[PDB]
Design a protein around this ligand. Sequence first.
Ligand SMILES: [Zn+2]
Ligand SMILES: [Zn+2]
Lengths: 98, 114, 194, 243, 179, 82, 56, 49
Amino acid sequence: SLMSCISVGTDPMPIITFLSEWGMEPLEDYVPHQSPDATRVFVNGVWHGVHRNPARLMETLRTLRRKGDINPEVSMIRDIREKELKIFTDAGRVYRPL
Amino acid sequence: TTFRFCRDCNNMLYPREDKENNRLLFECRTCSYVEEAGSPLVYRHELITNIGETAGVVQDIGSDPTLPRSDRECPKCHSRENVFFQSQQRRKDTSMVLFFVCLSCSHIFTSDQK
Amino acid sequence: DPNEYNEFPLRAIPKEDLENMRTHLLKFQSKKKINPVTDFHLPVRLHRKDTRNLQFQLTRAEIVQRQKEISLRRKTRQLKVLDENAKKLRFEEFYPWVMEDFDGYNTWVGSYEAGNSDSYVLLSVEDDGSFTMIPADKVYKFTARNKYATLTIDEAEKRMDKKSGEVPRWLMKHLDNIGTTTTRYDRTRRKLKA
Amino acid sequence: FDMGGYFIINGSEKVLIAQERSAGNIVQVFKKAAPSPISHVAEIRSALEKGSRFISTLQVKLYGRSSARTIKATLPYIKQDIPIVIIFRALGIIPDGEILEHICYDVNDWQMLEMLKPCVEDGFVIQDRETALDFIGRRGTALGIKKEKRIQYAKDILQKEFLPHITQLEGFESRKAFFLGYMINRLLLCALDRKDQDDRDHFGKKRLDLAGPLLAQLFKTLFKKLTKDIFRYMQRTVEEAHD
Amino acid sequence: EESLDLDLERSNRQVWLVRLPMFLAEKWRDRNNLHGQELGKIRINKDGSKITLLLNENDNDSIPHEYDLELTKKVVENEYVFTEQNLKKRDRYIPYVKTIPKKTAIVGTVCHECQVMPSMNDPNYHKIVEQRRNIPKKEILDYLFKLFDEYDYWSLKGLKERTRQPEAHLKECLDKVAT
Amino acid sequence: EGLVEYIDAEEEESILIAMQPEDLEPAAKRIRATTFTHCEIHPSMILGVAASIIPFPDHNQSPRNTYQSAMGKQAMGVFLTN
Amino acid sequence: LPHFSKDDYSPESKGFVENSYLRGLTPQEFFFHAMGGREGLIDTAVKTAETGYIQR
Amino acid sequence: SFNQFVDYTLQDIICEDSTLILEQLAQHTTESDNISRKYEISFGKIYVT
Ligand SMILES: [Zn+2]
Ligand SMILES: [Zn+2]
């Protein structure tokens, strides 16, 4: 379609480091009991760890990608129903403005 | 029907029988720790399942936009705001039950009319 | 804040002591608190050994008792290159860290995890209140092993082969009652008694 | 007016066309038909941009429609599918409660735990990590100084080739374990009918390959051919000279 | 030379573990740093549960000075930190697997883990966020007799280096007497 | 400065769209929720290049659109100026 | 379709084109119309080859 | 897509596999001894016209 566009990919490492710095638990000390409801975080499929308060991260990443500090091809989803949070930054996605 | 693990080494205790006193000795197989169970019920099947219609109630459902909103009252707090959605357990023979959750009382209630 | 606490900002380590030492990190895997300096039959020999057939391995007390009783070229090749640090890491962790008591009653086997050893950094208050400053280098996770007289490969294969509708429920207990495949602590006890 | 992203080959204007494919590195479940002994399978494709094409296909399979309740996982280069408790021990998780903590997350529910009990009973055979790592998966090449299999060789498999995203280096077995447990949980949810069957014609699970990636494929292939050819003529210039 | 056992008396020591922001880790893992100096000050409440880091101006304001030190774990168990400095220098048990157990030493246990977080109100704080966004037929005849006396399987190549002579002359001499 | 957003094919499983910028924005011609996060730019931009030439494409049958979109590539006119 | 809240079964949400060709279609209805037509086309494109083979 | 492939992805695909070495010490015993003849070939920055 007319305003369609194609993602060209961007290195996920700044996002990974950033997202660690704003509060994660890296998977190596995750335990299901002590965090019975915290949210999984994925980046291009690879799990990177669990996080406690998801909404603050979600709005923060929205503000950051709206301020122009993340390449706006990056797409995030908070699937609230399943305690999921996905970050996608590969090439080859299809997106349209809004 | 739940599993009890060996406290001494995290492996589930297995049913094994006292040959003479006739008791339910849940014994560990990894180590030699043994445990007396409570009830003669061991195995359990449930050939018919009918549960799961209210799944995934997270504490912050109202943060999503795509849930609709209505005007029934929570019969704990009577706030006129609420959120409703379809039953979660997606089988071909489930119902049209609506589950109302209110943001104020954070309380779930249905609208069954049997 | 008023001095309601040991306000000693960091005193860094001796740089001359920093060389030729590496300070890793120990991790245990059990729900109960473990203090080896109390529980273990000291002396404790933390070694880096191969673990091949550690069921038939050495007890220190058994070793002491046994010692007391006795007394064309191809000319063409290609090295597909690899990082020197990674290769050295492979060489170092080609054997893991093993620590036991003197009896061999309880053994613990380490392994390497590469999560966030770099980002961690150590701060210990000393006896005088000195706050020492150590950049931690690596972390090792240790699991107890053969605390319950583990079985072995071949009879295990005959067990897991589809010859039975179900394997025997108390098969390990029956094998122990037969007497085969004793624990390492039991082997040490038998060698001490004999 | 000739805004045109095309090429001139032999004086004729040639154009690429975007291809598509399923999204890599993403979880799909399936419901294979009744007459097959398999009922539900999970798939993970993978890639790593894109040395030797990085196919690295993985499955988790389920059997039966009862008593055939078992979870065999396929894996290269292991010629037989393996029950998963062996794999958990192979990654280095011994005690069964913590295998279960890897798999399921709500300790209160149980239906998954009775669903997993037979696989635990399969796992009653082997109680140590290298005594799991030993298991066969021959598929070549010639064995070196071995007894049955090098434990070193099996752990080299699990390190280098297996699941070639989340890591490849040396030390991330716990991450591999959680990833596997998540996969099992997804499969088990699909077969336990709490979550529906996946879809393949959702658009977001597709990507559009395009001029850059296509040129990347040709360039990688051609340059690896080139590297092989330059490695030739350098070993066999035994006589002079360094041209 | 020394003993083969580890150290134990430093078991009963308190060690604190810090998760660190990566710029601050690079500043604090320097060999030209680590000289006993005190680049900051810590501040615990009387009631606990909140620590800021009073970093001194040695950092020269590129990084902040007010760091909200967040205690990640209040109580920590089964954690022991140990060192290893190098050492001064059916019963067929292998004695030497070339294990080289150096001077291993406990130095304490861990009760707390905390994370350093710079307080966002500092101008250097959140500036780092956009920074992260920015980034001789007879003689040789007798000589041959000694040579095969030295070695009866004397090869032609060994013969040639022991002669340095015309080879056709060498070969016609050898077969006339022996092999 | 945060006025438009690029949205891939998945966040539509997380967002809500308005047709018009007036459709629910204040609280004999044609027959035509309060939690909108996005509004689409213009609904006519769901079309493609060929189908953006059909006048009043909302006023006929879809297979006829498909035929026309096929045939238009066979038309002739100018194609360039050089 | 992403322009409605979840869990509806009102006919306009699931695809009843109430309107008429004189008045034209609201864009959602336009999309559903495209769906139906596409279904017809692909059915023709498969049935023709199969019926030709069986006729031969 | 093309601009991405030219600006990056090309230097990347070169630098990921630049090294190629045949460093010859002796590849047998002696040779007395011999020394480690580093025949190495590696690629650096690339150029486009
Ligand atoms: Zn036990
Ligand atoms: Zn209420």
